[PDB]
Amino acid sequence: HMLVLVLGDLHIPHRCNSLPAKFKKLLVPGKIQHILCTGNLCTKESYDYLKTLAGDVHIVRGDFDENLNYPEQKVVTVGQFKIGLIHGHQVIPWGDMASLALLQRQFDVDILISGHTHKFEAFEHENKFYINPGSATGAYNALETNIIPSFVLMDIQASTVVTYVYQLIGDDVKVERIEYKKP
């Protein structure tokens, strides 16, 4: 199995100062193979942290990132899946399903990862898989402050992805599972 950590919208240090303590206890070196980050680390502190978790770290540019070197979008292959990554402030109106399906078509990907809304989603539409990891710190968004901290871990093998969703809710880590098969 190839394990991929998917996360972003940390907004450290301006909106939040760290990941939840219970998330940090679970996220330990030596397990994760790739990190796909939707952006808004905003600073090198968090980039450095991700590199402790895995060597292969991919970030795309958020609207509040200090680092302008990050690409606006990326397409990568893991296992048999072509995966697209974008922060998603380019989606107007924010989180619009039609807009996401349009990005999927434009990128020609099996899995589209996007952020910006700070709300977790993992669902299959028209036989393509769409993931939004939410905000790993529970940072406030442009509309709301009751944000649940979350991140996703995709376990890829061949034609199958098992997506595990981690949420900090009721002071505890809650885990949920969803499965997607490439057609």
């Binding site: 199995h1 996220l27 397990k31 595990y164 809650k174 885990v175 949920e176 599972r177 969803i178």
Partner: peptide
């Protein structure tokens, strides 16, 4: 997505 029970595997489950 389906919530996991105590016995279920997930990749960050301590071991």
């Amino acid at each position: 997505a389906v919530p996991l029970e105590f016995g279920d595997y997930h990749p960050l489950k301590p071991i």
